Amino acid sequence: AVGACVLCNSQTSLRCGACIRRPFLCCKCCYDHVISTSHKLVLSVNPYVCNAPGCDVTDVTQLYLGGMSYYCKSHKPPISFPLCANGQVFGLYKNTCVGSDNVTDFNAIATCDWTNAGDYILANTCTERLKLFAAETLKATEETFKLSYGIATVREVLSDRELHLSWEVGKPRPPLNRNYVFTGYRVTKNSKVQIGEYTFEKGDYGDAVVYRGTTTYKLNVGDYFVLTSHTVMPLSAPTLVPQEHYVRITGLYPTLNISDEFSSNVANYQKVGMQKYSTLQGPPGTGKSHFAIGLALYYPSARIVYTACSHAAVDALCEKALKYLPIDKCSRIIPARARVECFDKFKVNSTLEQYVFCTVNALPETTADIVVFDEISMATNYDLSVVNARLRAKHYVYIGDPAQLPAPRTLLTKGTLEPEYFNSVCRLMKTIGPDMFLGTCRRCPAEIVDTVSALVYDNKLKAHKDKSAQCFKMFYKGVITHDVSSAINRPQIGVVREFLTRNPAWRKAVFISPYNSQNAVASKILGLPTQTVDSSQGSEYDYVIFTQTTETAHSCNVNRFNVAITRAKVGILCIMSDRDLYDKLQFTSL
Amino acid sequence: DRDAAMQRKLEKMADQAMTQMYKQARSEDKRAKVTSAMQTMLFTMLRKLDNDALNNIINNARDGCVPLNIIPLTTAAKLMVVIPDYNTYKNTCDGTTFTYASALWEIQQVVDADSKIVQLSEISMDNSPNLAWPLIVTALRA
Amino acid sequence: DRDAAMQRKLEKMADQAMTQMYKQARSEDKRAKVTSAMQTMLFTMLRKLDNDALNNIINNARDGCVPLNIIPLTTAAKLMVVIPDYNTYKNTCDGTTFTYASALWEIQQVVDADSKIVQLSEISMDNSPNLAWPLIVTALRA
Amino acid sequence: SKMSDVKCTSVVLLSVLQQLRVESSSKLWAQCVQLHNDILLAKDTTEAFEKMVSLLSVLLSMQGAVDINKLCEEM
Amino acid sequence: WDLLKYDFTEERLKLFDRYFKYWDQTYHPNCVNCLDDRCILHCANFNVLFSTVFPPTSFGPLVRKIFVDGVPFVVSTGYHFRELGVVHNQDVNLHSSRLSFKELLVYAADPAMHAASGNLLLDKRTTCFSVAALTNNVAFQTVKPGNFNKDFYDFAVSKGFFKEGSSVELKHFFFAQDGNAAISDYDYYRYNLPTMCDIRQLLFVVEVVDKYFDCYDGGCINANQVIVNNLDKSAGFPFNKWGKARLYYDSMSYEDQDALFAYTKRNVIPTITQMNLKYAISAKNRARTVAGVSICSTMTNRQFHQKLLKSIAATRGATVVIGTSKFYGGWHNMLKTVYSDVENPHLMGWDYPKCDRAMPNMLRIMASLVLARKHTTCCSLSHRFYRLANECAQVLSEMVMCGGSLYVKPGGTSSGDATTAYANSVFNICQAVTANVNALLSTDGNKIADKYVRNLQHRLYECLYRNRDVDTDFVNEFYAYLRKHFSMMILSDDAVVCFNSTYASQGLVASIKNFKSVLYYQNNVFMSEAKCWTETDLTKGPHEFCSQHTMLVKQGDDYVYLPYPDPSRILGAGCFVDDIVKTDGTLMIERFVSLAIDAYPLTKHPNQEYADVFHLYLQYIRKLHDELTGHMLDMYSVMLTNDNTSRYWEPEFYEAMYTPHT
């Protein structure tokens, strides 16, 4: 079992045991990593523990290769020799291992807990192999953080539709939403075995969870739940395939009078054809995801795979394609579990169709003639490597904007991440500039765009509509109920309910709030379609009601608020909390 | 001598292990990389031959002027080849004659991806930039 | 050392006995698997039989014994015709019904050598070069 | 050595074609086998080169099978 | 005729009484009533003629509906051979309750259930009788091309090989085949025609061949005395769906292997043989197919024939050179035994076109009866007849699985039975003795100057057509005459003869034209004289025997005969392989050591391009060891302590391979 060193790509047979991802390391690089950090376990084809009758020594400078196995200092056969010595660590391909100077960044990548902010800015400006290793270990740490969530149990059941919850005393409680699942135990005497796959969500009154299960087993009070784990697969493909500038379009063919609507983006289509990969950066609602469909109409014969990190963004892209592209040749690829309700209007789950839409995580290994990644802000380097590995292509197009909200990054809790370190694509966009850039808002009215050209974008956007005066900024205190570990603002929802029967034209406005708890609990009291800000990105609606639940650093985030307001099409009413945020925008009186 | 005998037994088993592990590693490495290695070997041997017909068809394939069927050997047999741009047409097609595979062919029928028949007079610097490229040319071996 | 020699023999013969016992248990737990597989194959083949036609032809036998070569030829409900070229197809089973083994068969399917479905309109004198011969036609006894 | 270089190149070419699942299309695999066997049973170099052109046209006709540009840039 | 009719005994008797009315030897339509093997051949020879007028659907296994634990099976309780007539089983249980492993194996081996459950088949690709289609679709098996060892080829061309006009050139390749190969090879059984033999002549050739096979001993052995060479081999259809031959040699104790063998002496077990395409290197592009016979047939045929077969393989200095190595002076010993005091020696070698597919059923039955003459004490007459019937039902005229479809094999030997090379040797000796008999009888007689050969011809005619009882004195006399003037060396279809040239020119001993005539009227083939060689000079040895040429070298102080192969064959084996991991070289150094062992005698060839093949292999072995040690020292930092690979690029290790000390 041999491999290639991560930071020099020499031949090797050693791995670091203490590292979560267990990466291959050549002799020189492994010695540099172990003699300086706290990692002191090295796995060869056989692990480097001491082979006494009973002995537990793992530190590699203590050990020797004695007789025919690895033995510690006072268990060795009288004939030596030291393992970790002569500036190297003894392994296969010993005299062909060239070291590096990247054993100063690799120590930081392996050691860091991804708590600070500088770990991300060092995990995205390093070499290309470290860009993959850091993403791999970041996903591994994000997965292993779920192992610290408190074990549940059931109090009792008065109502079989709403479970009672009881967390273990002395551990944190995980948030209750759709993303997290659970699997049970019945450990009484008597079946320490799983009892099904369940999921939870809080109830408005008292303490209760209106649960859901894959089966229909009941819980005798001893039965309980534990959050399971998602093992993270290894990744190999580079984050960005290296760019080559062709003299002329290769592999793609133009069209005969593409349309009267897409006639402006022709030069950018030709530029896309010329280059190996292209980047389109634009303020929201300027024509970015309506550029990809225009590109499809410009290269009609080219098989195209559309992808995105979210589901509610690729669903909006699917709806737009249905509005424009021929619906017969489309698809939609959904995961096996399909946690969210996906788009069922095309021939779902047919990979070999000409235009194929899918999320990044559920991408199947295939080919294409151009692959369109969308909303790269939501995507981390893991998603870029995944899409670059599974989908082969002739041309790549990444469309998105950095000023929108980035990926969650649950582990990050100190400092703020600048846009230019969201991933490699955003770094390319901010460093040298996008290959295609279109700033002119075609979706939102004049008032909301004229306010968002003051929050996030430094007075760049002109736009095209007339301010319909249906942009409202509300003053309401909004008392706090930190219920589901995500806040719920009952009196703000009350303000909305008391002034949604006074607005006969606002009966279908989508309800937007940064917190998933209020966003989900609003469905009973007003009945509107509900949507969180993170998933609302990429989708437009004719009318939006936005509610700033609580003053924090999450809901008063200028990027989040800017991506929230700019989903409106003719009008938006928003109720605010921060005296500053309500003042920086210029809306109507109330 | 007893210690030396057990020393030699131990080193013989060491050599056994070394040889067996090397055989396993090399066998799995060679069986893993069987497609790309064979393709690289094939193109190395193709380059070493340096035949003028093989080099011609390979250079056209790099540009995208690939055939649609097996290149025929019998005289007055049909070859269908896709031409993706006017550059590949200008070198290969002179009048009604088509040079390919170190052989001369008589152009019979030019179509588009719409299968529309296009006359040889319509292929030019000005009218083709509105045509439905790539063309497909059907010719006969002359 | 004299008793250590007996201990060497003890451990050697114990390991040999244990290996023999493991091998015998493995060869006895692999025998039951093939016995069950043969039984399932035989009983599925029993369930495949066309019992009424076979009963008729076997009761017509004077001794109860019939040639094996007539068992399909008089009782099989499905006929597979493998045809190498178009002239043979026209000769033996042209049309949707034909006669073989003094019986009437109706074409239920035609596939090519690639196991792709072929329609009866595609089997023509001019469309013969475009078909992956041989053609396997599956017909049912009428 | 030019006659024997053609007879080995055809062997490697048919191995590549078999790896590319040309074997699934019986009508194409029959032609590839015929060309390969007639190259191996050849006394004249020109006939072998013409049949090698015909056999390489099978590899060059399938666009999505091999990367010609990457393969020809390793030389 | 009625389809259900299978017993044409009265029709056969009417045919015999209508045409051969005054042929005064007793004729048995069913050869189960014959008095010995001299009577089985006579009545089988008549049945060969009489079976051509009966429907082909009436032959084969005779099935019957039995019941086991209440469920009705359809099992074969007999057979209808075109040569042996109708044979019924003696142990037939119409009502059973449990099936033992032996009975389960018997009921799975026979084609009664497989044909009775499969679909009807009409395969127009062949003229052979198609029985059934087991699956719902036809399988088209292809053959892959070989794997190119580019490192060895580059090393060879760097040494000056494969140049234009060179005498050593690549002619052996791995030829690929399309899906229509396995059914195009099986269709060559269209060359097997029903051949009625001259019975008064065949019955004397049988005695002479039995004299040729008199030095051996044979008989039945127990199941614990059977030695199988490789147990990781296919078990045939349907037994290959669950394991190899190891599974069935382990799952059956010796008790229920002896039970199966004793079952085959009172019952006929029909058997399905698969046709397997052969993936090997050859000089011609025609596909080669082998016959994978079921384990139920191979086991019993081993238990029946293996004692005699091992006795033949352990005898040195006989006519049948099987088990004689060509190393350590074995080739020289064979060639000195061929030249066994003949007077005017000329060497001769012939060819059998379509040998395994044009062999008549009468000659295969003759070979099986000659091999079974050793069972004069272990077997009864009925036991030997039922063993012959099992041989015919499983080998001679069987059901053949070719691409998921059952066909009927018209005849000819299958190349996968236990006694294949030895029965082939019996057939070859029989054809040679027949050629000598025809040569001696077709001579004038008034032109024969030697008074001993004239009386020999007179008594040969008397013993052929005027004598019905065996004259052992004259059989011994003719055997002595053949050994004195027609010395032979047989390996199953290769034969070197060291005949008397003066007698053969006078017509007293068989020539090439006599073999051509005999193969025309007794094999239904034409033997072109372009594949048959004659050597007037013994100092050059046989032109070709077992694909090896022979040359006379001075070894030590004396001249010996060494066999060298085709240099094209050895270079093709080096350059083209059947696996991707045989291309690494460092993994397979024994692969090239064996090839250098085979290619050593080329160093004595007068052509230098032939002598350079051995040096090329030695230099490639040295380069392989150099780069193997380099790669090993790279994968570690220490060299191997014990390395004895230096002796494989020294020519003494290979020179000692052809020295008679061992």
Ligand SMILES: Nc1ncnc2c1ncn2[C@@H]1O[C@H](COP(=O)(O)OP(=O)(O)O)[C@@H](O)[C@H]1O
């Ligand atoms: N050329 C155009 N002419 C008129 N309207 C356009 C044009 N391009 C885009 N639009 C409108 O602008 C909106 C932009 O949508 P989209 O591309 O999804 O924005 P984003 O990419 O920022 O989400 C679309 O809803 C479309 O109706």
Ligand SMILES: [Mg+2]
């Ligand atoms: Mg968009």
Ligand SMILES: [Zn+2]
């Ligand atoms: Zn580490």
Ligand SMILES: [Zn+2]
């Ligand atoms: Zn390294």
Ligand SMILES: [Zn+2]
């Ligand atoms: Zn220790």
Ligand SMILES: [Zn+2]
């Ligand atoms: Zn008889």
Ligand SMILES: [Zn+2]
């Ligand atoms: Zn016997």
